[PDB]
Amino acid sequence: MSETPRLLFVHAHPDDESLSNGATIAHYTSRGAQVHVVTCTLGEEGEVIGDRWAQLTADHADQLGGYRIGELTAALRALGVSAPIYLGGAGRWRDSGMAGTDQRSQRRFVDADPRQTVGALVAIIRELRPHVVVTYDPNGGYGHPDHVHTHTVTTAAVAAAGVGSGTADHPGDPWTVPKFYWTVLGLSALISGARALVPDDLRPEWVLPRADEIAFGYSDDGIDAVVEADEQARAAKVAALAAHATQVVVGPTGRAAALSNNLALPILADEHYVLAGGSAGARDERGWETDLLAGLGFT
C-alpha cells in the first residue's frame, strides 16, 4: 500500500480522461492524492471543430495528434495532473479511427503487439503502483475500437503486473492492483442531467439528443460505485473540457458541452464505475461505494 493514495486512469484519446473522469480526477488531486493518466494514442484520427486547425486532420496535413498533446497537457493541468503519459511513448501507437472507418496505417493501436502494449502498461503499473486503476468496460464505452483495445490491454496488464517476472539478476518488481474499476456511463444520472439543461446552456447550433442516439447507459443496478464531486471539481472538469478546443466546446454557462457532432451533453459532477477486480468497501442504499479508495484504509 503506502501513505498518499495513488490512482491511475487509462484512456484511449486526448479528452477521454476529462469526458469520463474529469470530476473524479480533480476530486482526488485536490485532496492530495497522486493521480496519473495514461493515454494510449495521440488522437491522430480526430475531427476538428473550427477552421483554424482544420487542415491538421488526417485527410489534409495529418498532424492533429501532435497538436492535441498541448490540449491534453492543458486539460490535465486543469485537473491537477502535471503531465501526460502516452503509452509506449508519444506517437508509438496511432489512433485507430472510429468504428466502421477503414483506415490506412501500419502503426494502429488495435493492431499493436500485445507483448509490447501490455508490457508497456505493466511497467507503468509497477512504477506507479496505483491503489486504483480505472479504464473502459469491455465494450469500450460507446464501442470505439481503441476504447475496447484499451480495456483489453489494461485488463491483461493488471493481471500480469502482480505476477513474478524478470531474471535472477533483474527480478521484476510486481504490484497487485488493489482495486480495478470500469468507468461507465450512468443512464439515470445522464437523463437527470439532460433534463436539467435550459436553452441558455446551449449554443444555437446544438441539438438535444433523443433516446436512440444515446447510447449505452448502465442501470443503477449495474453500477457499483460513484464519485459525487463538488462544484470545484466539476469546474475543473469544465476547464479541462474547454482545453480540448479542437474536440469539445463548452456552452455559455459551463453546464453543457458538445463534440463535433453537435449533440449537446450535460457536464456532471457525478461519475460512475463498475468494480471489476478487488474488494468493495462500504456500500450505500443504492449498493454503491461513494469512494474508489473505500476499504483501503486511507480514512
Binding site membership for Zn(2+): which residues? 13, 16, 147
50 binds a copy of itself (CB under 8 A): no
Site membership for Zn ion, residue 234 (CB under 5 A): no
Distances (CA, A) of 205 to 190, 202, 208, 248: 21, 8, 10, 14
Q: How far is the CB of 12 from Zn ion (least distance, A)?
A: 4
User: 13 or 234: whose CB is closer to Zn ion?
Assistant: 13
Q: Which is nearer to a copy of itself, 82 or 232 (CB)?
A: 82
Residues 6, 11, 13, 94: which binds a copy of itself (CB under 8 A)? 94
Residue 227 phi, psi (nearest 5): -110, 115
**Which member of 68, 108, 147, 255 binds a copy of itself (CB under 8 A)?**
68
Q: Please tell me whether residue 16 binds Zn ion under the rule CB under 5 A.
A: yes
Any contact of residue 194 with a copy of itself (CB under 8 A)? no
Site membership for a copy of itself, residue 44 (CB under 8 A): yes
Near a copy of itself by CB under 8 A: residue from 4, 55, 188, 232:
55
What does the longest C-alpha to C-alpha distance in the chain come to?
A: 65
Go through the chain and tell me how many residues it has. Answer: 299
> Quick one: which of 6, 13, 68, 131 contacts Zn ion (CB under 5 A)?
13
Interface stretch with a copy of itself, choices 66-74, 163-171, 267-275, 284-292 (CB under 8 A): 66-74
> How many Å apart are CA 262 and CA 12, to the nearest integer?
22
Closest distance to a copy of itself from the beta carbon of 39 (Å) = 13
String of DSSP letters for 64-104: HHHHHHHHHHHHHHHTT----EETTSTTSSB---STT----
Q: Least CB distance from residue 281 to Zn ion, whole Å?
A: 29
Residues 6 or more apart whose Cβ sits within 8 Å of residue 204? none
What φ, ψ does residue 109 adopt, rounded to 5°? -60, -45
103 interacts with a copy of itself by CB under 8 A: no
Q: What would the grid cell of residue 258 be?
A: 458538445
3-state secondary structure of 252: coil
